[PDB]
Amino acid sequence: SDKTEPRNEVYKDKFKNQYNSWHDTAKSEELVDALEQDPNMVILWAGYAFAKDYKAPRGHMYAVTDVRNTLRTGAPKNAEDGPLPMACWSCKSPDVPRLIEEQGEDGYFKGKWAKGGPEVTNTIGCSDCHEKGSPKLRISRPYVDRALDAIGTPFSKASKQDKESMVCAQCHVEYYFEKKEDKKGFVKFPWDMGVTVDQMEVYYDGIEFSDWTHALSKTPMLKAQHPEYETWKMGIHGKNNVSCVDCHMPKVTSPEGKKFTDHKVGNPFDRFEETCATCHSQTKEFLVGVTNERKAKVKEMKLKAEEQLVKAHFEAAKAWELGATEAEMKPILTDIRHAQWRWDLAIASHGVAAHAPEEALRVLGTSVNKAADARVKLAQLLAKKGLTDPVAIPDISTKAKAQAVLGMDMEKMNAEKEAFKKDMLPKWDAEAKKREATY
Amino acid sequence: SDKTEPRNEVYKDKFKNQYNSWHDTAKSEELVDALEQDPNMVILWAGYAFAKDYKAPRGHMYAVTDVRNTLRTGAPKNAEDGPLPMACWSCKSPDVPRLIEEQGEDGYFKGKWAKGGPEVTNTIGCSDCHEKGSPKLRISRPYVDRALDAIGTPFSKASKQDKESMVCAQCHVEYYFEKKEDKKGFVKFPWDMGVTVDQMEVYYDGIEFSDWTHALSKTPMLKAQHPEYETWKMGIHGKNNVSCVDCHMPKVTSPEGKKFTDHKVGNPFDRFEETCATCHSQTKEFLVGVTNERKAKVKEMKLKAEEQLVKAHFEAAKAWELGATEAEMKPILTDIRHAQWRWDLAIASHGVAAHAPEEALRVLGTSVNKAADARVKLAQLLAKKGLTDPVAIPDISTKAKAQAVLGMDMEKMNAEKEAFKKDMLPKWDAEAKKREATY
Numbered sequence: 008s009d010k011t012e013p014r015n016e017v018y019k020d021k022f023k024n025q026y027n028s029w030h031d032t033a034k035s036e037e038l039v040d041a042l043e044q045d046p047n048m049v050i051l052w053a054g055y056a057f058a059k060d061y062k063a064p065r066g067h068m069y070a071v072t073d074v075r076n077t078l079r080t081g082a083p084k085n086a087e088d089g090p091l092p093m094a095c096w097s098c099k100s101p102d103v104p105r106l107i108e109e110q111g112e113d114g115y116f117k118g119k120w121a122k123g124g125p126e127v128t129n130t131i132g133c134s135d136c137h138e139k140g141s142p143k144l145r146i147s148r149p150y151v152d153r154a155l156d157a158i159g160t161p162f163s164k165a166s167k168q169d170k171e172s173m174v175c176a177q178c179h180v181e182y183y184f185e186k187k188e189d190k191k192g193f194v195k196f197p198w199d200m201g202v203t204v205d206q207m208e209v210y211y212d213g214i215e216f217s218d219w220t221h222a223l224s225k226t227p228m229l230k231a232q233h234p235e236y237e238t239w240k241m242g243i244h245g246k247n248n249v250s251c252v253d254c255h256m257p258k259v260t261s262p263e264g265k266k267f268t269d270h271k272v273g274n275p276f277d278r279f280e281e282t283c284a285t286c287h288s289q290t291k292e293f294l295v296g297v298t299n300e301r302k303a304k305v306k307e308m309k310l311k312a313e314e315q316l317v318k319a320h321f322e323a324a325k326a327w328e329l330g331a332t333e334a335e336m337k338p339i340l341t342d343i344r345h346a347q348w349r350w351d352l353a354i355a356s357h358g359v360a361a362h363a364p365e366e367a368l369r370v371l372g373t374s375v376n377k378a379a380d381a382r383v384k385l386a387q388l389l390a391k392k393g394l395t396d397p398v399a400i401p402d403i404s405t406k407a408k409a410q411a412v413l414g415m416d417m418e419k420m421n422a423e424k425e426a427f428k429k430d431m432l433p434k435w436d437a438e439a440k441k442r443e444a445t446y
Numbered sequence: 447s448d449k450t451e452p453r454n455e456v457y458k459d460k461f462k463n464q465y466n467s468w469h470d471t472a473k474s475e476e477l478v479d480a481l482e483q484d485p486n487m488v489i490l491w492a493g494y495a496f497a498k499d500y501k502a503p504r505g506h507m508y509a510v511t512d513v514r515n516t517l518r519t520g521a522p523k524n525a526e527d528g529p530l531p532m533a534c535w536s537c538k539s540p541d542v543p544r545l546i547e548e549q550g551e552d553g554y555f556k557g558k559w560a561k562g563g564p565e566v567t568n569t570i571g572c573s574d575c576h577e578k579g580s581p582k583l584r585i586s587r588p589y590v591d592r593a594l595d596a597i598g599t600p601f602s603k604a605s606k607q608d609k610e611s612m613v614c615a616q617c618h619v620e621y622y623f624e625k626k627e628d629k630k631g632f633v634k635f636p637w638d639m640g641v642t643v644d645q646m647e648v649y650y651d652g653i654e655f656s657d658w659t660h661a662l663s664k665t666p667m668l669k670a671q672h673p674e675y676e677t678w679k680m681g682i683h684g685k686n687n688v689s690c691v692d693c694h695m696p697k698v699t700s701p702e703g704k705k706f707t708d709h710k711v712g713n714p715f716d717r718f719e720e721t722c723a724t725c726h727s728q729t730k731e732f733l734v735g736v737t738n739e740r741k742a743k744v745k746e747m748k749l750k751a752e753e754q755l756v757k758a759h760f761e762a763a764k765a766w767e768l769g770a771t772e773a774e775m776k777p778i779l780t781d782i783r784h785a786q787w788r789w790d791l792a793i794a795s796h797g798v799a800a801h802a803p804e805e806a807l808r809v810l811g812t813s814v815n816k817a818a819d820a821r822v823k824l825a826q827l828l829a830k831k832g833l834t835d836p837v838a839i840p841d842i843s844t845k846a847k848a849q850a851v852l853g854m855d856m857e858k859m860n861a862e863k864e865a866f867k868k869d870m871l872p873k874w875d876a877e878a879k880k881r882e883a884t885y
């Protein structure tokens with residue numbers, strides 16, 4: 008494509024300071040296993056890909072590696088195999104706008120994730136945010152322009168300060184895959200009714216959309232994903248239009264005293280002077296302390312919401328086992344769907360305790376309120392089927408125990424994934440090397 | 447006494463600007479009936495004085511008037527009559543340090559509220575916060591000193607900025623009346639553990655303390671009251687030691703050009719220049735909009751928490767009615783106690799949406815979590831008693847209907863109060879005038 012250069016090294020000794028700091032996200036290499044740290048999530052996501060594997064994000068340099076390696080994308084043997092579609096590449100690589108610009112959105116989104124393996128081998132890079140070889144910013148994905156239009160803030164009419172967050176909003180948002188034949192597997196941001204948890208809930212309910220049917224409760228479930236842009240808009244910094252870039256890509260000075268934009272996307276406290284100290288006079292120790300306090304508050308309510316949902320899902324499973332009808336279960340499943348949507352949207356962003364802690368805490372409160380409705384209705388229904396005692400919860404104290412409770416063959420899944428990693432990934436990179444040898 | 451002057455006019459000509467702005471809290475005279483606006487509260491406080499009458503605070507000039515007029519103090523015919531004790535005067539008048547200094551705490555707290563009628567007639571004034579005829583600040587109540595010592599911040603070692611909030615903390619706190627024999631009727635702040643909702647819950651459970659037994663659920667209840675200091679400490683302004691005085695008693699300039707401390711304690715937005723604008727560049731409309739949005743979020747979770755509690759109380763009443771035993775109800779009552787403690791502390795301060803919105807939202811979330819646990823246990827227990835259908839809630843849509851549901855003879859209460867107002871209060875004021883003549 009004329010508009011995209013997916014090879015990130017092309018403009019490196021033309022834009023040295025930007026390339027070098029961009030490459031330094033490789034320094035953020037630790038992989039924290041969130042399922043291991045919180046096995047409740049295996050149960051909440053039962054029947055869905057996230058019950059297999061879910062880790063915290065690390066540096067942008069690892070995006071293609073991590074989508075390749077997660078158990079969620081499976082072990083496809085050919086371009087028509089594997090569980091997930093092409094759309095799983097969309098926020099991982101500057102080869103995505105290359106493919107969209109050459110084949111159109113309809114050509115890009117067609118088919119399996121495995122199909123794009125040979126084509127999507129460059130990780131998150133310059134062409135995702137920039138015009139080719141230029142410092143100018145751009146939106147490189149058409150579905151992003153559609154989403155910005157939908158909330159009335161098109162990129163073409165946005166201020167410089169607005170665009171700084173919009174380039175991150177290409178990826179750091181809640182999304183779903185459309186179902187209609189002409190948009191099958193297209194990425195869409197569910198923003199037509201607004202970006203609050205309540206508006207998005209109305210959107211999804213209006214089209215009767217579900218990401219999966221829960222393996223225990225049979226609830227039509229919604230999955231939230233990293234809603235940084237939607238939740239940043241709710242926090243006081245976003246209300247002041249303090250941009251993602253102000254904290255995550257701050258203006259820094261070279262050893263020679265030249266200012267440039269720090270491209271090492273990571274922890275803003277690592278550049279405390281240049282980030283928080285730009286606008287605040289408090290010490291780093293104070294502001295780190297405040298941030299850790301909100302993380303603790305959000306975590307407390309997160310676990311309370313999760314404990315209610317775990318019990319709700321097993322209680323619903325027991326209700327089905329005791330002969331509940333679909334009509335008896337319909338209002339309970341609605342409550343479970345909404346309760347878990349609210350928990351998931353509240354904490355799916357690993358930055359929410361910094362970006363919008365009060366919104367996270369409000370939303371987790373509404374989660375518990377819906378879970379309480381579901382569980383009281385379940386307690387009455389279970390009693391009509393003859394059970395007036397608590398429903399037993401199996402041992403789910405570890406990720407391995409939870410996945411086994413669900414009947415998941417983790418040994419086989421890991422073995423097949425390792426064989427895929429060893430056999431298929433070399434072939435993909437060998438094909439990409441051959442193709443890039445043109446260009 | 448030597449160290450207190452309760453007549454607030456004595457130094458009016460020496461300190462004209464302070465006296466004049468102090469007297470201007472009489473401009474804040476609107477009375478908002480909180481029970482009328484939220485009749486749920488009648489049910490939540492069933493069996494307690496707050497089910498009778500509860501209004502939003504107004505100006506300091508009305509403290510003695512409102513404590514005289516509230517149905518909560520009833521209609522005493524003599525100094526040993528009436529529902530409430532001497533300690534209800536403690537945060538309403540500079541006559542209180544006068545009586546404490548002359549009679550001791552033991553002498554002051556002894557007896558009924560009606561006994562203090564003739565002695566406590568000056569409203570909140572200069573000697574409550576100041577040394578006599580002086581600009582120096584003081585703590586005028588010994589139980590406040592004990593509380594400050596308990597949290598490790600004695601007034602003697604406090605900074606200027608610390609002391610600005612501490613004078614408000616003499617009254618704007620959660621408290622209880624001790625029941626121990628040697629301290630019976632004493633005001634104490636429940637801060638030994640210290641000031642979060644969770645620490646105070648541990649404090650109260652450790653001494654097996656209850657304010658009343660709920661009229662419906664028979665739960666041993668805790669009542670929260672206006673925890674401004676404790677919640678201010680949790681908000682970001684308090685963490686920065688932005689004092690109550692910075693927003694509510696700002697430095698202003700007289701018409702003659704003289705700088706002084708504004709003593710019109712009221713809405714900080716009424717002094718936007720001089721309060722927020724001294725630290726913030728945003729417009730007043732923007733900051734008002736933010737505070738209004740937080741008020742709405744807090745109100746949304748407040749109402750969800752109350753709906754859960756109202757149903758829990760009626761469901762518990764049903765369980766008792768169906769023959770539940772003490773042992774069956776014990777874990778349910780514990781959950782209701784904690785759930786309502788958390789609700790009440792979260793919203794008992796009318797400023798919590800400005801002072802600490804994130805803490806109010808966290809605490810309201812934990813309220814719903816405990817109410818959930820109570821209602822699920824109740825649904826199972828009700829089913830063991832043969833009831834598998836929802837418990838009916840009577841019409842409680844107005845203050846009047848809710849009080850009638852509880853069997854409250856509001857007509858008699860109001861008649862007896864008006865009679866008390868017409869007959870007793872002139873006698874109290876006449877005796878005080880006679881006594882103050884001898885000053």
Ligand code: HEC
Nearest residue numbers: 061062063064073074077079095097098178179182194233
């Ligand atoms: C199709 C269902 C997929 C799959 C299989 C993956 N993604 Fe994404 N992704 C996006 C962003 C902003 C992040 C970092 C923020 C965060 O994770 O909270 C990620 C992260 C990942 C990972 C690493 C972490 C993990 O979950 O283990 C993996 C393995 C992963 N993704 C796989 C952004 C997006 C999107 C932007 C709209 C899209 C679409 C996807 N991701 C889709 C998928």
Ligand code: HEC
Nearest residue numbers: 018022025026029131132133135136142171174252267268
């Ligand atoms: C791949 C290694 C690159 C290269 C070579 C560059 N970028 Fe970026 N960039 C991003 C943002 C938000 C800005 C600020 C824009 C502005 O203030 O107008 C920049 C800035 C630049 C410049 C301009 C000079 C400067 O340092 O300020 C240049 C020359 C540049 N970049 C080169 C955003 C992003 C990304 C979004 C996550 C990504 C990816 C990149 N840039 C990648 C690259």
Ligand code: HEC
Nearest residue numbers: 035064065066067069070073098135174175178251255273
């Ligand atoms: C606009 C300048 C931003 C900002 C501020 C961030 N991103 Fe991204 N991001 C994407 C994916 C898939 C990941 C996970 C990577 C992986 O786990 O392999 C991330 C990761 C992050 C982080 C975590 C960094 C760390 O060191 O832990 C952060 C702080 C972050 N992002 C912020 C996806 C994308 C994009 C897809 C092309 C785009 C564009 C951005 N992110 C842009 C931004």
Ligand code: HEC
Nearest residue numbers: 172175179235236239244249250251254274275357358361
């Ligand atoms: C604009 C919408 C964004 C986006 C997309 C992100 N941020 Fe932030 N962020 C800030 C701080 C202090 C943290 C936590 C640092 C810590 O944990 O110590 C975060 C966290 C994130 C994450 C998660 C990072 C991870 O490794 O898990 C992500 C993906 C993220 N942010 C993206 C600080 C700020 C701001 C300061 C006022 C601003 C504005 C933003 N971030 C904006 C955004």
Ligand code: HEC
Nearest residue numbers: 243247249253254275276282283285286287294297682726
């Ligand atoms: C760097 C990572 C940080 C951190 C840790 C914080 N900020 Fe900011 N901040 C800015 C503005 C305009 C406000 C609103 C208040 C005001 O009008 O001054 C804030 C507010 C905060 C808070 C209070 C909100 C809360 O979370 O309790 C906190 C704790 C906070 N900040 C921490 C402005 C800016 C910036 C201007 C572009 C920048 C950069 C930052 N802040 C960065 C940080």
Ligand code: HEC
Nearest residue numbers: 474503504505508509512537570574613614617690694712
């Ligand atoms: C330290 C300077 C303060 C500040 C900032 C406030 N108070 Fe008080 N207060 C007390 C009582 C009994 C009331 C209710 C009076 C009534 O309704 O009759 C109040 C009221 C307030 C308000 C509401 C003002 C309004 O205009 O509505 C406000 C903003 C307020 N207070 C703040 C009791 C006391 C004390 C007991 C003697 C003392 C000391 C303080 N308050 C101190 C302060």
Ligand code: HEC
Nearest residue numbers: 500501502503512513516518534536537617618621633672
């Ligand atoms: C003994 C049980 C009583 C009674 C009957 C009253 N008080 Fe107080 N009071 C205090 C503060 C800071 C306020 C204003 C803040 C707020 O109300 O949220 C009040 C207000 C009142 C009112 C007017 C409002 C109402 O409830 O209608 C009334 C009628 C009232 N009080 C009666 C402070 C304190 C204390 C400081 C530790 C103490 C002790 C009391 N009050 C005790 C009582």
Ligand code: HEC
Nearest residue numbers: 457461464465468570571572574575581610613691706707
């Ligand atoms: C009853 C009408 C009075 C009078 C005559 C005065 N006060 Fe107050 N005051 C309070 C606080 C926190 C301050 C600031 C203290 C400081 O910054 O050191 C003041 C200030 C004064 C002064 C000093 C001159 C000035 O205007 O700054 C004077 C002479 C003065 N006051 C007289 C607190 C309170 C109260 C707490 C709620 C109340 C009640 C009063 N003051 C009452 C009076």
Ligand code: HEC
Nearest residue numbers: 611614618674675678683688689690693713714796797800
């Ligand atoms: C220090 C511990 C205190 C105390 C005792 C109080 N405040 Fe504040 N407050 C602020 C704002 C913007 C409001 C809302 C005004 C509005 O409703 O528009 C409040 C509210 C209160 C109340 C309730 C007022 C009422 O009339 O019902 C009370 C009793 C109260 N405050 C006492 C602003 C601030 C601050 C701004 C940074 C500071 C600090 C404080 N208040 C501190 C305190």
Ligand code: HEC
Nearest residue numbers: 243287682686688692693714715721722724725726733736
């Ligand atoms: C007058 C009643 C107000 C109002 C409405 C607000 N402030 Fe303040 N503020 C101050 C400090 C140090 C912070 C922390 C952030 C920082 O370090 O700059 C804040 C924070 C806020 C916020 C953001 C937090 C939130 O609740 O979202 C808001 C909305 C806010 N303030 C409003 C400092 C001060 C003061 C210095 C003495 C004064 C006065 C005020 N603020 C007054 C007000």
Ligand SMILES: [Ca+2]
Nearest residue numbers: 182230231232
């Ligand atoms: Ca989604």
Ligand SMILES: [Ca+2]
Nearest residue numbers: 621669670671
């Ligand atoms: Ca109390």
